[PDB]
Design a protein around this motif. Structure first.
Motif, PDB file in Angstrom:
ATOM      1  N   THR C   1      -0.983   2.661  -3.464  1.00 46.35           N
ATOM      2  CA  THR C   1      -2.192   3.637  -3.827  1.00 46.35           C
ATOM      3  C   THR C   1      -3.459   2.812  -3.385  1.00 46.35           C
ATOM      4  N   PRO C   2      -3.615   1.520  -4.058  1.00 45.81           N
ATOM      5  CA  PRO C   2      -4.548   0.513  -3.062  1.00 45.81           C
ATOM      6  C   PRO C   2      -4.175  -0.041  -1.785  1.00 45.81           C
ATOM      7  CG  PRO C   2      -4.248   0.059  -5.533  1.00 45.81           C
ATOM      8  CD  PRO C   2      -3.046   0.856  -5.057  1.00 45.81           C
ATOM      9  N   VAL C   3      -2.857   0.582  -1.123  1.00 43.56           N
ATOM     10  CA  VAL C   3      -2.370   0.076   0.058  1.00 43.56           C
ATOM     11  C   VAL C   3      -1.780  -1.110   0.228  1.00 43.56           C
ATOM     12  CG1 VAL C   3      -2.967  -0.133   2.421  1.00 43.56           C
ATOM     13  CG2 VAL C   3      -3.745   1.847   1.444  1.00 43.56           C
ATOM     14  N   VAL C   4      -0.501  -1.075  -0.005  1.00 44.31           N
ATOM     15  CA  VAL C   4       0.505  -2.247   0.094  1.00 44.31           C
ATOM     16  C   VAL C   4       0.474  -2.653   1.308  1.00 44.31           C
ATOM     17  CG1 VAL C   4       2.819  -2.789  -0.631  1.00 44.31           C
ATOM     18  CG2 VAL C   4       1.659  -1.357  -1.872  1.00 44.31           C
ATOM     19  N   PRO C  54      -6.942   1.979  10.582  1.00 46.60           N
ATOM     20  CA  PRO C  54      -6.223   2.621   9.278  1.00 46.60           C
ATOM     21  C   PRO C  54      -5.691   1.527   8.611  1.00 46.60           C
ATOM     22  CG  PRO C  54      -5.443   3.641  11.553  1.00 46.60           C
ATOM     23  CD  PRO C  54      -6.660   2.518  11.615  1.00 46.60           C
ATOM     24  N   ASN C  55      -5.927   1.280   7.288  1.00 44.14           N
ATOM     25  CA  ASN C  55      -5.381   0.775   6.127  1.00 44.14           C
ATOM     26  C   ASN C  55      -6.039  -0.685   6.014  1.00 44.14           C
ATOM     27  OD1 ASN C  55      -2.152   1.853   7.296  1.00 44.14           O
ATOM     28  ND2 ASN C  55      -3.281   2.658   5.342  1.00 44.14           N
ATOM     29  N   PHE C  56      -7.213  -0.904   6.979  1.00 49.37           N
ATOM     30  CA  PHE C  56      -7.646  -2.402   6.597  1.00 49.37           C
ATOM     31  C   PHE C  56      -8.460  -2.208   5.364  1.00 49.37           C
ATOM     32  CE2 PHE C  56      -8.080  -5.965   9.656  1.00 49.37           C
ATOM     33  CZ  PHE C  56      -6.997  -5.559  10.380  1.00 49.37           C
ATOM     34  N   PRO C  57      -8.590  -3.248   4.512  1.00 47.02           N
ATOM     35  CA  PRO C  57      -9.394  -3.481   3.493  1.00 47.02           C
ATOM     36  C   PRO C  57     -10.750  -2.983   3.495  1.00 47.02           C
ATOM     37  CG  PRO C  57      -8.659  -5.608   4.140  1.00 47.02           C
ATOM     38  CD  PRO C  57      -8.169  -4.628   5.153  1.00 47.02           C
ATOM     39  N   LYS C  58     -11.167  -2.470   2.292  1.00 51.47           N
ATOM     40  CA  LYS C  58     -12.702  -1.928   2.238  1.00 51.47           C
ATOM     41  C   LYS C  58     -13.613  -3.125   2.046  1.00 51.47           C
ATOM     42  CE  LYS C  58     -15.762   1.286  -0.193  1.00 51.47           C
ATOM     43  NZ  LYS C  58     -16.391   1.988   0.874  1.00 51.47           N
ATOM     44  N   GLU C  89     -14.090 -13.114  -3.743  1.00 48.42           N
ATOM     45  CA  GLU C  89     -14.614 -11.768  -3.890  1.00 48.42           C
ATOM     46  C   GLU C  89     -13.834 -10.636  -4.658  1.00 48.42           C
ATOM     47  OE1 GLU C  89     -17.829 -10.629  -2.562  1.00 48.42           O
ATOM     48  OE2 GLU C  89     -18.062 -12.771  -1.542  1.00 48.42           O
ATOM     49  N   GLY C  90     -12.742 -11.112  -4.760  1.00 49.48           N
ATOM     50  CA  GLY C  90     -11.897  -9.993  -5.560  1.00 49.48           C
ATOM     51  C   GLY C  90     -11.175  -9.258  -4.897  1.00 49.48           C
ATOM     52  N   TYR C  91     -11.041  -9.625  -3.490  1.00 49.25           N
ATOM     53  CA  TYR C  91      -9.761  -8.824  -2.777  1.00 49.25           C
ATOM     54  C   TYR C  91      -8.426  -9.117  -3.299  1.00 49.25           C
ATOM     55  CZ  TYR C  91     -13.222  -8.322   0.767  1.00 49.25           C
ATOM     56  OH  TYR C  91     -14.825  -7.687   1.275  1.00 49.25           O
ATOM     57  N   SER C  92      -7.566  -8.215  -3.391  1.00 49.92           N
ATOM     58  CA  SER C  92      -6.119  -8.379  -3.917  1.00 49.92           C
ATOM     59  C   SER C  92      -5.205  -9.181  -2.765  1.00 49.92           C
ATOM     60  CB  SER C  92      -5.553  -6.894  -4.232  1.00 49.92           C
ATOM     61  OG  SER C  92      -5.050  -6.445  -3.188  1.00 49.92           O
ATOM     62  N   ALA C  97      -3.158 -10.193   2.787  1.00 47.96           N
ATOM     63  CA  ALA C  97      -1.873 -10.172   3.612  1.00 47.96           C
ATOM     64  C   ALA C  97      -1.864  -8.986   4.809  1.00 47.96           C
ATOM     65  CB  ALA C  97      -0.659 -10.111   2.762  1.00 47.96           C
ATOM     66  N   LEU C  98      -2.614  -7.841   4.581  1.00 45.31           N
ATOM     67  CA  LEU C  98      -2.086  -7.034   5.613  1.00 45.31           C
ATOM     68  C   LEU C  98      -2.699  -7.393   6.905  1.00 45.31           C
ATOM     69  CD1 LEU C  98      -2.161  -3.244   5.684  1.00 45.31           C
ATOM     70  CD2 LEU C  98      -4.031  -4.166   6.971  1.00 45.31           C
TER      71      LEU C  98
END
Ligand SMILES: Nc1ncnc2[nH]cnc12
Ligand SMILES: Nc1ncnc2[nH]cnc12
Ligand SMILES: Nc1ncnc2[nH]cnc12
Lengths: 284, 284, 284
Positions: C1-4, C54-58, C89-92, C97-98
């Protein structure tokens, strides 16, 4: 909402378990990968998939086996976790803690744990066993201790003391049995470093752990030990050494999971026999 | 959505506080457990429950006291946190940071902090005080620093320097006052290790901290120090030593929260008097 | 849901990238702040904002540049990340990894990385370069490793070995080129400590890292190295030394981001030329 490991939720799981089997277990066991053959020898056993038990953690993303097994070993009544939950898979503190607290409510007074680990101390060789006598918990020092969160007062205190987490008399019993069967040349004692994982320790990390007084390093066991000590369950934990990471770094040799499982295959039958006897001789 | 510790949200809390009391405080204080008697002696005081203040963190899961107290000590205007927020309870980075940033917007220029801690350096005994001169932040090294997240530019810079986080002139003032009252034999200086908690340090962890040059270890204070230094608030932090963990390991003696609170009881009145005088003498 | 960062999601990003440019890149590059001038010299380049893929982090909370740039350097086909993602910065784990796994699906076989870092080893001065030969990953030891979570089997194994993460032949090539241009007096090799950040290391933390055998310390690079090694991409990583933190502690000198960027300005043109030549000479 992700299901807290609290008294009400653990009691609902225990109540389901209690009415599906007739076993009141005294002993809990958690086995390392490739080291679970004893669980197939449990007499008059009841197999309960995690997915059937109220409030047990969801494990379908990782897949593979996940059952609780109840029955008799050496005339003693036991409950086993078949398919361990590891924190590097992304399970939360509450998911790790709930099965141990269920063991407590079922009546478990002693928890036996085995794992695979890397050797740091230069005395350790592939295929040796280490009786864990203490640990260095790098996740705990860095704000990822398994007990971070509200305290569940019915199970234990806010600030546990870990001075006696690894029971001294259980270490002496496991060593005595290795002497009676003449494999005490394989058995050491040592301090375990918890590396969250899932990458193996790099050569420079291994050399740092040597300077810090660590004898063995692995990716499990410390979370379960801390939850057990919190609620008054005595612990014995044994590591099977897959390789000596310091020697491998000096010779530029890689470690991989295939080599790890071959070591597990080589020692599995000896370990099953050892733990069957420990279970038999354990003080009431 | 869990309420970021940003400029708008801190200003709404400050605005509520400012219109419920008439105090513009210059000094903030955060007191360790059992060490809060000074807060009962605040003159012409206003007690504001956290639960009444917009955007303050929710603390009902843990329970127990949680108030902001404003008033006068030694002719100086102060704001106190009564019932500290600790990261081992599960509070987030944003929940820890918001009350300190509210202190900033109220006009706080100096923050005084006390805690209970374990002694590592062999010179420390139960009942001694340590003036903290630097720290080793194991959560920060391991990606749980209190500032992880977006930077709030109105409060401070993206990459703070912590070289001067523990104000040197405030350490010299606290030491001078102990000399004028002839208890300087109780006062040391030292480096503080932050252990996330909530388990006490194991014997092997204590021995590792000794090798690494740590004098004291505890479960608080470093997060508040970092938020204060980020926004330009000067800090004095004092640890009260409950036990010497290295000596306890050599003699197989356990530490527990009951023994900790008895030490707090033994030193509480001396510490209250010391800090009342520090507050009085603090440079404008 | 936060995009694996899984195979399906990475393939959707790669498919968009592939149809907006005609470049099949062999080499990936990630540049430190102030060190990105090479990306402006990419020939026949295509600039793709992260927000369009598509699917790149915000990345809008942090702001500032965020593009993927494709084109030719030295006759080789490359993809560059312009505006790096840092874990402080708080990225997961999944957001870091993406983009690397997208590089893999585009055909990247080698990843070149530069960063700014603090010097620990007393041989390092401001303006020197360090070829990284190994690392100490304090977030990984403390349960914040970039690979914590389910394993994505199509990309690599559950338990990676990091013995060869820093390619030996690429280190020898980068050193050879510095010798041919007579600036090898600026080039060292060393072990990198990952400090999650974003506070600079305190003086007592720096002194601990010296005891532990660390030569350099910084806030990036290790997460990308681990994701690359997991999926079989070879890595070269170079640190530009901003200051010597041990010497600064002995002389009571502060570090700040302004001084860091001035060092980057002083070395930017030499580094651009060095990496352009490394790219040109890289083995097929
Ligand atoms: N070298 C190693 N071998 C087996 N299990 C491990 N867990 C962590 N390091 C290990
Ligand atoms: N030994 C100890 N005594 C009191 N507080 C502590 N916090 C961490 N360790 C402690
Ligand atoms: N001293 C330092 N200078 C530059 N970048 C850094 N990252 C971490 N420490 C640093």
């Amino acid at each position: 909402t992700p299901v807290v490991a609290n008294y009400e939720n653990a009691s609902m799981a225990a109540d389901y378990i209690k009415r599906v089997s007739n076993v009141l277990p005294d002993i809990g066991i958690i086995c390392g990968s490739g080291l679970g053959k004893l669980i197939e020898e449990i007499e008059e056993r009841k197999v309960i998939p995690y997915i059937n038990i109220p409030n047990f953690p969801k494990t379908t993303v990782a897949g593979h086996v996940g059952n609780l097994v109840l029955g008799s070993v050496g005339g003693r009544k036991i409950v086993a976790m078949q398919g361990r939950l590891h924190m590097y898979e992304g399970y939360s503190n509450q998911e790790i803690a709930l099965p141990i607290r269920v063991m407590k409510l079922l009546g478990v007074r002693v928890l036996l744990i085995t794992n695979l680990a890397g050797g740091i101390n230069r005395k350790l060789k592939s295929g040796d066993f280490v009786l864990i006598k203490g640990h260095i918990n790098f996740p705990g020092l860095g704000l990822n201790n398994v007990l971070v969160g509200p305290n569940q007062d019915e199970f234990g205190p806010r600030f546990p003391d870990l001075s006696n987490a690894y029971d001294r008399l259980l270490q002496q019993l496991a060593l005595k049995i290795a002497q009676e069967n003449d494999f005490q040349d394989l058995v050491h004692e040592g301090v375990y470093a918890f590396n969250g994982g899932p990458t193996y320790e790099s050569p420079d990390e291994s050399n740092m752990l040597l300077k810090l007084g660590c004898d063995v390093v692995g990716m499990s066991t410390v979370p379960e030990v801390i939850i057990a000590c919190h609620c008054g369950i005595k612990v014995l934990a044994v590591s099977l050494i897959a390789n000596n990471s310091i020697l491998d770094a000096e010779n530029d040799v890689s470690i991989n999971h295939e080599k790890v499982l071959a070591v597990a295959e080589k020692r599995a039958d000896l370990l099953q026999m050892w733990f069957k006897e420990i279970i038999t001789r354990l003080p009431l």
